[PDB]
Design a protein around this ligand. Structure first.
Ligand code: HEM
Ligand code: HEM
Ligand code: HEM
Ligand SMILES: [K+]
Ligand SMILES: [K+]
Lengths: 156, 157, 155, 155, 155, 155, 155
């Protein structure tokens, strides 16, 4: 019933969300470990958001009578300090966003407009995340790394 | 520096088992929902959430002990194709998890990591509760027949 | 001081309650084990009711100056499946109820009208239990074993 | 699923709990009969606690695929006055505690860590009871028997 | 029209209530006089309860078309210290309870089941009071009279 | 009666807690003096936590019929600046935690599973304390000492 | 900077409070162990009060640029029964109170009127403590030791 390449696209986006869930979750727990609790909580909330996207992808694939793939897990990008963690998340999101545009082009072409609408809602969320990530990296330049980390020791 | 290395390897192994379980239970949940078996869908969803909570505690402990949590390696999901197989797959998964937990606890005891032991014991209790639930559902399928069992799980509450 | 045979009757009724406590408590936990939670909860309340009747019997025996006998525990009738368990409970209650009638006769004869009244209240409760049991057995015939068990999975 | 000697240990601890349930329940009603209502209420809660321990044991045994034994009831130690009743409870709890330790040794050996944990929680609660018991007997010595009883007349 | 001998029995139980009202009332105010206020309050409440039994007997006699007798007051057993006051109440209750069993035999025999039920409720109450009285006498022995009285100074 | 070596081990853990109580309290008060109020409040909570541990140890020793030793006070590790204070706290907890492991091995050996459980709960809280301390020292490196102290001026 | 001798005196009072904290805490816990819960609770409150005094002394020393001494712990006076425990507490407070007077004279002399005021507040609370202690010892004589202990069993 679903278009076969729409389902391949939905699984591919799903594969991206599955990487992100784990990467964000680890980076969150690394920040907590280091006592940078505000970064930790924020990253924890990014990880939950990716879990909610994966749910919606999984529900759609199953309705389209595809088989969701949660077995393949691509490469986690894990940073070694706060700057690299944030850059690692940004590299993940730039790739996820590219795959999202490509999935949407194809849904349009086979008139799977509901799948298209779902991917656009994810894409808007991923662009907000890009903005958060770029912004954090800019603040590191503007206030200095030590100040930036200080401002993230204590939770909101 | 602080953690025993084999404790860490044990913890990453349990964590690996939790990560399979998260994905397996989450897909079985959504498969059950897709079929309109909503009470099963919701119960399996809560099993998946509980495994996510246990992964979180293991990750925090690994990191305290100065090890590196492994979330990169995902072992084999046991995906069933109908209700009876999905339950059995979950049970086969738990029986392996539970064996692994016992071996870890043995080792924690040996090297005096009594806090890690205690965490693993709480997870074990919780996995043994799951085994009870799983075995009970399979026994009920026998006692009330599959059609009734499935009917009793169409609606939530 | 109570009539000595009244006390022996009170101790016999208590002996029956003590069997029922343990038999119903085990049947309750067997049903919970099997995922038949409504049967398990009902059977648990029947066990608690037998505990309360044992308590009244103990209090009365002590007031009458007798020795409550909590030591001798008779035979538990344990079933291996739902129909057997309900039938065992019924067999137990049919025996308890005969003992209650015999005891009441004796309290009447020696003018122990308070013990009689106490035993009549337990008898009413036991007859309502017989009714519940006979009814479950009937429902099993009417709706079929698998339906009947299905109806007792969720609390 | 269960290890067979784990199950025998669980049934033995269960057996000890069945004795304590009855012994404390009777001691409770005996204190009440005498108008020592505060000892009565205390002992009633000790009995209820042992009922909850038995429940947890039954459920564990059934999950491990054993047969809970509620049929065998060992010897109740019943005292004839307050000093002896407290000593009988203490002697019962010293033996309980010893069996709980041997059972935990065995769970540990065959890696039944959940059964071990359950028995350790029971043990903590039996050691609290030993403390209450030892303490009442020391109070009998410190304040005198008549005072001690007087302090236990009113709830 | 009631049975004649039913009515005679009801008026007899009523005379026992009228003695008891006045004896418990006086014992209460003697206790209050001495500053044993807990005994005084408890005894007040026993007196009020006898008043309520008397009222039920009066109503029933009048419904059966008899004449209630409140003129013939029997012998009050008034003690001169706590121990005697309590034994007096208990001597009065043993008699009351015996007259009660007789009335009930007679009601059974002429089929006055409602009068019988009324007398049985009173008998249960009178047996509770026997329990209280025997308990108190027991306590004086176990805790010593001085302690027993001290425990009844404050309400 | 407890095992003699368990009481020595409990007394040794107690000894460690008595040192920590005083060392944490003084560091707390030194932080408040310098106007580093958040550090002062955190450290006061740590000192309070050790006071609670000490209390449980004391209750347990006495139950076991031992004599709690509150007389021997070991050596306080008092730093003179924030970095040294934190490291002295960590040096203390490293020793405390080693001693707790050795106690727990002995308790397991002689089957004192309640003592073991108590010590394990204290160990888990001491380990959480080590985490806090290692984390703050690391934050000093990541944010710089001046920013780290500034972040602990206000509560 | 405070006067050097005032800091020595504050450190000496502090020293007394550290002894009292531990001595009162242990007596508290010994009373709870024996089931004299009211004495145990009162004594715990006394130990807490000394902890608050110690805190104020510590804050004041540091303000005055001195070094609080929490390392030297003088000699605990631990009794072995209730009467001795009370007298050991009074023996402690008699010394503490003498030392506080000598401190206050010195503070007055060098014009440290805030220190003096702090010490006077501690002296008033130590004097209230002496009153409590002398009162309990007198009550032991007036009511007898058995009644006195009985009056302190329940909180
Ligand atoms: C590293 C693997 C994962 C970890 C460590 C993890 C952890 C967590 C935690 C701690 C929570 C909050 C649980 C609570 O306390 O209520 C949560 C929620 C949730 N998770 Fe995961 N999770 C993981 C993977 C997944 C995956 C693969 C999915 C795929 C569907 C998923 C779906 C969800 C959903 C839907 C929620 C509820 C979110 C909400 O609405 O609040 N999670 N997870
Ligand atoms: C196999 C032996 C027994 C078991 C397993 C058992 C189990 C239980 C349980 C689980 C409860 C509820 C307690 C709570 O959580 O609050 C209870 C209550 C109680 N039991 Fe038992 N019980 C047993 C025997 C007895 C016996 C022999 C007596 C005799 C008097 C008794 C008298 C009572 C009473 C009066 C209550 C409170 C009932 C109420 O709610 O009014 N029990 N029991
Ligand atoms: C220099 C030594 C000590 C200092 C400065 C100190 C100070 C304090 C303070 C200020 C409090 C809070 C009191 C309140 O606000 O009501 C407290 C509470 C407490 N202290 Fe200590 N104390 C000391 C020694 C001890 C010791 C040796 C013990 C051993 C048992 C102890 C046991 C406790 C307990 C159980 C509490 C109540 C904690 C709670 O809230 O649960 N104290 N202490
Ligand atoms: K700054
Ligand atoms: K007295």
């Amino acid at each position: 019933k679903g278009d076969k390449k729409v389902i391949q696209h939905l699984n591919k986006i799903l594969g991206n969300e599955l990487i992100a869930i784990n990467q964000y979750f680890l980076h969150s727990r690394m920040w907590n470990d280091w006592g940078l609790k505000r970064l930790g909580a924020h990253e924890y909330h990014e990880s939950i958001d990716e879990m909610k996207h994966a749910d919606k992808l999984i529900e759609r694939i199953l309705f389209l009578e595809g088989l969701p793939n949660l077995q393949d897990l691509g490469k986690l990008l894990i940073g070694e300090n706060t700057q690299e963690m944030l850059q690692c998340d940004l590299n993940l999101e730039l790739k996820a966003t590219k795959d999202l545009r490509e999935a949407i082009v194809h849904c349009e072409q086979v008139h799977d407009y509901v799948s298209r609408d779902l991917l656009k809602d994810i894409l808007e969320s991923e662009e907000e995340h890009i903005d958060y990530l770029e912004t954090q990296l800019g603040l590191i330049q503007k206030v200095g790394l030590e100040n930036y980390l200080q401002s993230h020791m204590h939770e909101d």
